[PDB]
Amino acid sequence: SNRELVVDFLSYKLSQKGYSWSAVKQALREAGDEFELRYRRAFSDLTSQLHITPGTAYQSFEQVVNELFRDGVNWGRIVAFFSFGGALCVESVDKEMQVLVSRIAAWMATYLNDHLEPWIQENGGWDTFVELYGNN
């Protein structure tokens, strides 16, 4: 379910770059698109400077995401989390490490389930996310 959201979002982002991986989902896709628009107006894509490899990808994922949520959680930072995952996947497919896509997806799902789920449930669940971000 969280895992399902993750795979849908990543597949959407991959398709936008011409790559292919074969209400909540729609809200998240749109939120991701808006997040990325805002990001590009402010900061350069630093994804490349991470040097993603199979041996280092989890550690880069884990360290960024831990730092993202260190000060706290909100729906906007959760959108950032999904967009970041998307960026890691696009870079991965770009550089012919497409097997990392399924690993990043799993890492994201596990992080959601183990670490963001308590906050999500405390703040109305994904239903509240749809109320706030739906049709946008």
Partner: peptide, 28 residues
């Protein structure tokens, strides 16, 4: 230039744009 510097920058950028996208209203 460091890996950890890159990490910290990305997370900071994500966090700031994330907060600009926070649509929640505090409870009344």
């Amino acid at each position: 230039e460091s890996q950890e510097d890159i990490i910290r920058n990305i997370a900071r950028h994500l966090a700031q744009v994330g907060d600009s996208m926070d649509r929640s209203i505090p409870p009344g």
